[PDB]
């Protein structure tokens, strides 16, 4: 079986937010429900990562490191995909029972975080990203940052990452374009991958502030609280090497 077909079969099942639409909306209420949904997505993302060919061959500490750095890029990228697929409009499709429509983005302080996520779906739509390109790109987001002193299994990681870079190349060629159009596409898709670092830095700035300010009463489930508690000191100590395809 092809490598991208193995990435396809491990795609997580649909998760519902459990949002009661018969109760009026509020930013605090939506942010709370989405944090709960986010924790459930990250639990499913662990099960997803363990099934990615090569991932379980890395040292256990490296597996933890990669899921802890990439959490937000995985969630924003998968969200961008659902939004791009479910609507050719400015909607954020977090869950089938919780879509951030035009009315919900008028809610106080909603747009601030939403604009970063809208950029992801806007870019996938502008570039007309395929299902196969998307799967290769999502795996590459899991492998997009390492500690400043590298991983325990750095050599094996470099081999795995290069393998999925080639898989993105193979997915691109399938679009039946010429050699010049394929080089432009590879450039464009790897440029979008690079820009996810900036998207995530903006999402994390807001998210870290919200997590630390206990007076806001914004709840995070155990899975997200544990990732954030791990990540805040790592960013504070400059302990992160963001991998880029372009300078």
């Amino acid at each position: 079986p092809t490598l991208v077909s193995l990435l396809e079969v491990i795609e997580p099942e649909v998760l519902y937010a459990g949002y009661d639409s018969s109760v009026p909306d509020s930013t605090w209420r939506i942010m709370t429900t989405l944090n709960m949904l986010g924790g459930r997505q990250m639990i499913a993302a662990v099960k997803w990562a363990k099934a990615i060919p090569g991932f379980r061959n890395l040292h256990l500490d490296d597996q933890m490191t990669l899921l802890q750095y990439s959490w937000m890029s995985l969630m924003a990228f998968a969200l961008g995909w659902r939004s791009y697929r479910q609507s050719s409009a400015n909607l954020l499709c977090f869950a089938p029972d919780l879509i951030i429509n035009e009315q919900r983005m008028t809610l106080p302080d909603m747009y601030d975080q939403c604009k970063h996520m809208l950029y992801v779906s806007s870019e996938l739509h502008r570039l007309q990203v395929s299902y196969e390109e998307y799967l290769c790109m999502k795996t590459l987001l899991l492998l997009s940052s390492v500690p400043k002193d590298g991983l325990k299994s750095q050599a094996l990681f470099d081999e795995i990452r290069m393998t999925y870079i080639k898989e993105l190349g193979k997915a691109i060629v399938k679009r039946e374009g010429n050699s010049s159009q394929n080089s432009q596409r590879f450039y464009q898709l790897t440029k979008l991958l690079d820009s996810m670092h900036e998207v995530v830095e903006n999402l994390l700035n807001y998210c870290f502030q919200t997590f630390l300010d206990k007076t806001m009463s914004i709840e995070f489930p155990e899975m997200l609280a544990e990732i954030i508690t791990n990540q805040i000191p790592k960013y504070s100590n400059g302990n992160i090497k963001k991998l880029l395809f372009h300078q």
Partner: peptide, 13 residues
């Protein structure tokens, strides 16, 4: 330290 994540990675799926 990261109890829940280590558990999910170490448990059998």
């Amino acid at each position: 330290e990261n109890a829940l994540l280590r558990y999910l990675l170490d448990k059998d799926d």
